[PDB]
Amino acid sequence: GTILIDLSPDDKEFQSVEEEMQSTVREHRDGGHAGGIFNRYNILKIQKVCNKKLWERYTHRRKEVSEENHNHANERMLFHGSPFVNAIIHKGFDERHAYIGGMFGAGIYFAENSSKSNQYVYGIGGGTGCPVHKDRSCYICHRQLLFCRVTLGKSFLQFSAMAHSPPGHHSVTGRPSVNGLALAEYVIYRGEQAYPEYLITYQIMRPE
């Protein structure tokens, strides 16, 4: 039941999503090994992801979390990169999209930094890079990320350099504790706590 609606670059909604993509790029401690070397993206397309059933699945769970947390869903817009972006937008997030080996346990991981999620487009650690050139830093091939609506509820704070949420919590927040420029990363343990709102198609751009 999924349909993808293209946003025009003139649409304020395109512009605000692009600006969150671009403004949350940072340098990574791997010097670009996983995600490539770039300071910015070439945004090719931004599509709104419309699926009534998946939306209602999300809002039902959101109300549950909200009622468990003094009427506060603690909803964020966060990035998600994955080899499975195309199954996600059709079938929703579930246990099969979880990073089993992630540092906060087997859950589904999201980033404030678009460049962090970009490191997972071709798999963990960038995998073997793009399908066509086997290049983790490919400047040619078209990549895709999701910009997702995520319900955090009461989030467990982890200071730091599917399973269940910690008892009494609905998510985990990975707070950066060494790299002062890194933004937070988050983990949910129920696929119903995220909705893939935007599909963004882009290239990373070679610095000049």
Tell me the binding residues for Zn(2+): 130, 133, 138, 141
Distance of CA 129 to the CA centre of its chain: 18
The Cα–Cα gap between 206 and 196 comes to 28
The Cα–Cα gap between 26 and 34 comes to 13
Judged by beta carbon, residue 100 or residue 132, the one nearer ligand F35 is: 100
Judged by CB under 6 A, the residue of 7, 20, 40, 83 near ligand F35 is 83
Minimum distance from residue 42 beta carbon to ligand F35 (Å):
20
Asked whether the beta carbons of 146 and 199 are under 8 A apart, the reply is yes
Binding site for Zn ion (CB under 5 A): 130, 132-133, 138, 140-141
Judged by beta carbon, residue 64 or residue 135, the one nearer ligand F35 is: 135
* C-alpha closest to that of 45 among 201, 164, 191: 201
Helix spans in the chain (H): 12-23, 52-67, 85-91, 114-118
Binding positions: 130, 133, 138, 141
Minimum distance from residue 146 beta carbon to ligand F35 (Å):
8
3-state secondary structure of 36: coil
Radius of gyration, CA atoms only, the chain:
16
Task: Please choose which of Zn ion, ligand F35, none residue 195 contacts, taking the beta carbon within 5 to 8 angstroms, the exact cut-off set by kind.
Answer: none
Judged by CB under 6 A, the residue of 14, 120, 198, 202 near ligand F35 is 120
Binding range to ligand F35, per CB under 6 A, among 55-63, 68-76, 92-100, 159-167? 92-100
AA identity, residue 56: E
Judged by beta carbon, residue 32 or residue 83, the one nearer ligand F35 is: 83
Distance of CA 128 to the CA centre of its chain: 20
Binding site residues, ligand F35, CB under 6 A: 79-83, 97, 99-100, 102, 109-111, 116-117, 120, 123-124, 185
